[PDB]
Design an enzyme around this catalytic site. Sequence first.
Site, PDB file in Angstrom:
ATOM      1  CB  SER B 203      31.622  24.946  18.256  1.00  0.00           C
ATOM      2  OG  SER B 203      31.902  26.206  17.540  1.00  0.00           O
ATOM      3  CD  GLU B 329      26.418  27.146  12.483  1.00  0.00           C
ATOM      4  OE1 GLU B 329      26.779  27.710  13.685  1.00  0.00           O
ATOM      5  OE2 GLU B 329      25.967  25.898  12.296  1.00  0.00           O
ATOM      6  CG  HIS B 442      28.093  28.492  16.965  1.00  0.00           C
ATOM      7  ND1 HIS B 442      28.212  27.863  15.880  1.00  0.00           N
ATOM      8  CD2 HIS B 442      28.960  28.465  17.688  1.00  0.00           C
ATOM      9  CE1 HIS B 442      29.174  27.239  15.980  1.00  0.00           C
ATOM     10  NE2 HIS B 442      29.985  27.645  17.127  1.00  0.00           N
TER      11      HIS B 442
HETATM   12  N1  LIG Z   1      36.938  42.807  27.601  1.00  0.00           N
HETATM   13  C1  LIG Z   1      37.747  41.471  27.480  1.00  0.00           C
HETATM   14  C2  LIG Z   1      38.363  40.619  27.963  1.00  0.00           C
HETATM   15  C3  LIG Z   1      38.968  39.622  27.582  1.00  0.00           C
HETATM   16  C4  LIG Z   1      38.380  38.797  26.363  1.00  0.00           C
HETATM   17  C5  LIG Z   1      37.187  39.404  25.918  1.00  0.00           C
HETATM   18  C6  LIG Z   1      36.948  40.867  26.313  1.00  0.00           C
HETATM   19  C7  LIG Z   1      36.142  38.785  24.992  1.00  0.00           C
HETATM   20  C8  LIG Z   1      35.051  39.538  24.482  1.00  0.00           C
HETATM   21  C9  LIG Z   1      33.919  39.765  25.412  1.00  0.00           C
HETATM   22  C10 LIG Z   1      32.717  40.365  24.554  1.00  0.00           C
HETATM   23  C11 LIG Z   1      32.980  41.077  23.489  1.00  0.00           C
HETATM   24  C12 LIG Z   1      34.309  40.866  22.653  1.00  0.00           C
HETATM   25  C13 LIG Z   1      35.253  40.306  23.294  1.00  0.00           C
HETATM   26  N2  LIG Z   1      36.399  37.448  24.966  1.00  0.00           N
HETATM   27  C14 LIG Z   1      35.632  36.566  23.984  1.00  0.00           C
HETATM   28  C15 LIG Z   1      35.873  36.623  22.397  1.00  0.00           C
HETATM   29  C16 LIG Z   1      34.595  36.186  21.514  1.00  0.00           C
HETATM   30  C17 LIG Z   1      34.262  34.649  21.746  1.00  0.00           C
HETATM   31  C18 LIG Z   1      33.242  33.955  22.431  1.00  0.00           C
HETATM   32  C19 LIG Z   1      31.747  34.428  21.719  1.00  0.00           C
HETATM   33  C20 LIG Z   1      31.031  32.984  21.118  1.00  0.00           C
HETATM   34  C21 LIG Z   1      29.901  32.934  20.718  1.00  0.00           C
HETATM   35  N3  LIG Z   1      29.467  31.707  20.745  1.00  0.00           N
HETATM   36  C22 LIG Z   1      28.259  31.093  20.193  1.00  0.00           C
HETATM   37  C23 LIG Z   1      27.011  31.238  21.039  1.00  0.00           C
HETATM   38  N4  LIG Z   1      26.714  29.888  21.588  1.00  0.00           N
HETATM   39  C24 LIG Z   1      27.794  29.650  22.755  1.00  0.00           C
HETATM   40  C25 LIG Z   1      28.399  30.330  23.529  1.00  0.00           C
HETATM   41  C26 LIG Z   1      29.485  30.229  24.294  1.00  0.00           C
HETATM   42  N5  LIG Z   1      29.912  29.021  24.280  1.00  0.00           N
HETATM   43  C27 LIG Z   1      29.514  27.954  23.480  1.00  0.00           C
HETATM   44  C28 LIG Z   1      30.263  26.896  23.270  1.00  0.00           C
HETATM   45  C29 LIG Z   1      30.030  25.854  22.382  1.00  0.00           C
HETATM   46  C30 LIG Z   1      28.821  26.347  21.455  1.00  0.00           C
HETATM   47  C31 LIG Z   1      28.089  27.382  21.487  1.00  0.00           C
HETATM   48  C32 LIG Z   1      28.455  28.344  22.683  1.00  0.00           C
HETATM   49  C33 LIG Z   1      30.033  31.020  25.087  1.00  0.00           C
HETATM   50  C34 LIG Z   1      29.385  32.248  25.231  1.00  0.00           C
HETATM   51  C35 LIG Z   1      28.239  32.516  24.559  1.00  0.00           C
HETATM   52  C36 LIG Z   1      27.769  31.685  23.828  1.00  0.00           C
HETATM   53  N6  LIG Z   1      30.782  30.978  20.930  1.00  0.00           N
HETATM   54  N7  LIG Z   1      31.634  31.472  21.512  1.00  0.00           N
HETATM   55  C37 LIG Z   1      37.631  36.661  25.417  1.00  0.00           C
HETATM   56  C38 LIG Z   1      38.093  35.489  24.646  1.00  0.00           C
HETATM   57  C39 LIG Z   1      38.964  34.785  24.954  1.00  0.00           C
HETATM   58  N8  LIG Z   1      39.547  33.869  24.361  1.00  0.00           N
HETATM   59  C40 LIG Z   1      39.880  35.507  25.979  1.00  0.00           C
HETATM   60  C41 LIG Z   1      39.565  36.813  26.622  1.00  0.00           C
HETATM   61  C42 LIG Z   1      38.395  37.431  26.467  1.00  0.00           C
END
Ligand SMILES: Nc1ccc2c(c1)c(-c1ccccc1)[n+](CCCCCCc1cn(CCNc3c4c(nc5ccccc35)CCCC4)nn1)c1cc(N)ccc21
Lengths: 532, 536
Positions: B203, B329, B442
Amino acid sequence: EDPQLLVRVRGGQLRGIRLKAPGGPVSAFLGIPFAEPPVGSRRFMPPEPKRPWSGVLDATTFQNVCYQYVDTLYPGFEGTEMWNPNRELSEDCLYLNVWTPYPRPASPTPVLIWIYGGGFYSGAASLDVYDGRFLAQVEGAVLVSMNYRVGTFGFLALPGSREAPGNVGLLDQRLALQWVQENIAAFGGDPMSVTLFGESAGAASVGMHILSLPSRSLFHRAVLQSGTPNGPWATVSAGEARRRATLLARLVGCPNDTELIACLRTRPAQDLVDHEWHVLPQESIFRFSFVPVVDGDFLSDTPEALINTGDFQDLQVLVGVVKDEGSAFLVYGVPGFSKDNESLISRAQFLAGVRIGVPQASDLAAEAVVLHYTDWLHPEDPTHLRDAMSAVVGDHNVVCPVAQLAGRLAAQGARVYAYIFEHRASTLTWPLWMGVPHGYEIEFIFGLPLDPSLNYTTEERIFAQRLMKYWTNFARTGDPNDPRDSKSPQWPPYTTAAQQYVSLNLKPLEVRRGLRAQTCAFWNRFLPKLLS
Amino acid sequence: EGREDPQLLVRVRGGQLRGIRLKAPGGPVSAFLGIPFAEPPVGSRRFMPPEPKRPWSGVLDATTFQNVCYQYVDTLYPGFEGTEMWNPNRELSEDCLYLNVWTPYPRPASPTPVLIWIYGGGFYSGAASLDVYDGRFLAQVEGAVLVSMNYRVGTFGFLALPGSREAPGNVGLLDQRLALQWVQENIAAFGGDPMSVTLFGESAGAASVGMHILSLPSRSLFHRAVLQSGTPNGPWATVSAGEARRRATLLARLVGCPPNDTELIACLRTRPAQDLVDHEWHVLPQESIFRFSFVPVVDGDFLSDTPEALINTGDFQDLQVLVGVVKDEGSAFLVYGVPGFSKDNESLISRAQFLAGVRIGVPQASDLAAEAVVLHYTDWLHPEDPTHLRDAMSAVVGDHNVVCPVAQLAGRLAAQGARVYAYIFEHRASTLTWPLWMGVPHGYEIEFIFGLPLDPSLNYTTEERIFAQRLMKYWTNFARTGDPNDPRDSKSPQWPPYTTAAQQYVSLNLKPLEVRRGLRAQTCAFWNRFLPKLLS
Ligand SMILES: Nc1ccc2c(c1)c(-c1ccccc1)[n+](CCCCCCc1cn(CCNc3c4c(nc5ccccc35)CCCC4)nn1)c1cc(N)ccc21
Ligand SMILES: Nc1ccc2c(c1)c(-c1ccccc1)[n+](CCCCCCc1cn(CCNc3c4c(nc5ccccc35)CCCC4)nn1)c1cc(N)ccc21
């Protein structure tokens, strides 16, 4: 003097001729006049009914072919010559032909009315591929076919005028239709069961009778083979019709509508034909100079509009396409293509052919067509680019217009049956790469493989019998399926949900789903938004 | 010393370290965890390029993982393993620039190839200390030396006021580069071969690897690269200088640092870390998924031009790259703010919800382009199947953000001299807790490449254990030789290079390698050759 070959029609007495069909005699009444010759001052005018005649009229031969351009792309070659005029050319050409069983059918028979294609600039009801003989003899049908004016004669229009209102070739057709309603009973035909069928421009014509209220009480069923009233080529707008008519007038020395039409009327026919290619707005293929016009009279609005909003509940329709709709149009001005070589093409040649295939496309629009049709595993393979160039033309002009037409009719209560025709005639003289080109199902539907002296295979004789059965079954009942046979499999109706159609090849019926659904979505739903 | 295990005492350029003997299933490994590689980037150093760690005295204790860089802790599904396994597992602190090393026990007699891991987390999260990045299995089983570093994420790593000296951007990448320098100078003390270093990352980690490839000062620091489910090109990994300025400025305002750069960055530096994290989401220009607020900026320095430009005109002859994608993905991204989706039901959506999703999934797209996406992805025989729409929504996100950029990357690299190997990973862990509809989401190959299934106490199937051994061999063979194939082995099917001519790539699943042709070729032509021209 065979009593079976003597008919009294409203306008007088007729003498037909007994013809030989493989399985028995048929009565044929050829060259019957249905309109006053549209000559001299009647040029570009609505047809008038044929005045009554004295004595007994000789209806034993096909009459003159409507004045039209004669194809010379390959002089002597059967693949083109078979579509060229097989009788003397004349403006005096409004005659129809009727075939019936011999003896005259006992009880009222279904009527099939054939309307030929030829891009609204050519064709004749006398060509050997439109021979009614077999359908008459084998299936017990009464089969009718009429000439209608083509090119400038049938379709030159100065819209909103009195002397050239346009759409007269379609009006010629409507007159033949009224003639059938008024006379066919006398041949054993059933005026209350009339099936229109036609190919290419003939299919668009059928389409237009569907879309024009005065035509609607002259038939009960319709068959559109490889053509549609909607689509890029079948109509022009009133503005664009006036433009071409005005430019033709100029090109032949004719300097106020009345003034213009008068001077056009003084001109030898061949002068008009000499200059008809020259009025087209772009270098193109599958575009024709003089076609039906959206007049607000014959066509109350565009076919697109009319098909979107009509009520089609008490209506049955059979539609379909051939495997390779566009291949044959490629040798008519796409650089790189010829019948005499395998026509393998560069990518640059493909982008160029697309600009010509889709003349109204902008750079972005054309680039989309290109990007959609490319095989990205073999993005520069000369075989694919050729097959794709073909496909572009076929899909854009026929297949996707057909898909759209079938879609809307089904949605709006019409009963629709769809097909794809995939057999390549053995006797074919065009090269293999063209596959099953535009026009080459007709010989099968008409049953020409039943004539043993045409050297069709035994397989093809059988296939032709099957197809004759589908078309005439459809004429009898609105359902191509054999009402006394089992197993089949059955040919199901086309519906917007299931999108079922069948393949007509040597194998038995196979049911498929979606007529180029992804690709047609591109053509019917995307590109419009793009070039906008 | 005196009574200590003599295999665990190692000196580096900053001083002495004491490591730890760890049990891997098949035997012991050496670990040196929490080695400082930078001056802690706290106080007046927040937002600034990292300075090399200053020598210490005595024997530094390197038996435990150090702090995780400051970040947003996920709270979408509290207690759920599926999200918590990615959450920090040590204290959060701005003092987080530490790295970890795993080597065989005893340390290998002759110099061993080095693998350097770079975690993902959208440039706003992650830590090299997560259980799935455990280097012990690759160390013990393959004899590899494995290194992973912490690097700053979110505002701390990527907030830029481009052109300023106090907040130049890309400092998270510079953390990563500093740890690569550390490996050059120090890795031989552990028996690693500084002349054979392969970066790998997933990623954002992958995108970071890609950026080291495209940034010249990083080029002398590694020899081979593996990009898992991420790329430097694409819609999410970088931002223009303008956009990053807008985002830094907006965040500043949100935390009460109103608009001159120096004054603003100074005020940002007085803010508590957590107030920066609490507000980082609020600077995104649209409602969207797979978009992150503070990411690498195209600064004309670290990145001399957009990654798209740099991969189009680069000479990549002397370069081997392994790249690839997982089966699904986009699926996991849908539950983070696409109306209609959830892990707790089958997520069967309507056509309306799909069109709405596409706007969110492709936030930069005009109406016409969104229509184009929807038209391309609709199954026209069943344009309203809930099931199909759900899977298309997943594919829209998957393809636009990962699969098609990967394709683009593999295409441009191969055409310009690189030996490129390509894969698609298709196995769904038997232990996964995300619903079946999400397929292989992912991130879920990582545990296989790291060889977690070999830990018998993790309830992986025996088939999975074998599968992981296989993958570990591919990855390390690639580190060792630049060829994932085993020399000694013999069909046992081969993994061919990916070329523009053949577009070959292998499937990775429980069955032996199957060669396929065209990494989603038609659809990627849509995203890579069509969409750009529609947003001109
Ligand atoms: N209410 C809020 C407040 C702050 C933020 C919010 C929401 C969100 C958010 C949460 C739920 C729904 C919509 C939005 N977010 C989240 C935004 C969405 C981004 C994360 C989703 C994601 C999904 N994945 C794929 C699934 N597998 C993984 C993950 C995660 N990390 C990893 C890391 C590397 C590879 C894979 C992997 C983390 C979470 C779940 C699955 N990676 N990342 C935040 C992000 C910020 N940078 C800052 C503040 C906040
Ligand atoms: N130098 C000139 C002067 C005038 C015209 C010219 C050229 C051409 C032309 C010939 C060769 C190459 C480029 C252009 N053309 C030809 C352009 C028309 C191209 C269509 C030909 C075509 C091809 N097909 C498909 C294959 N099967 C058929 C045919 C033909 N007719 C039919 C009719 C119904 C069903 C099938 C069928 C006629 C020709 C060949 C195959 N249908 N029609 C003319 C046309 C006009 N409207 C007016 C004037 C002239």
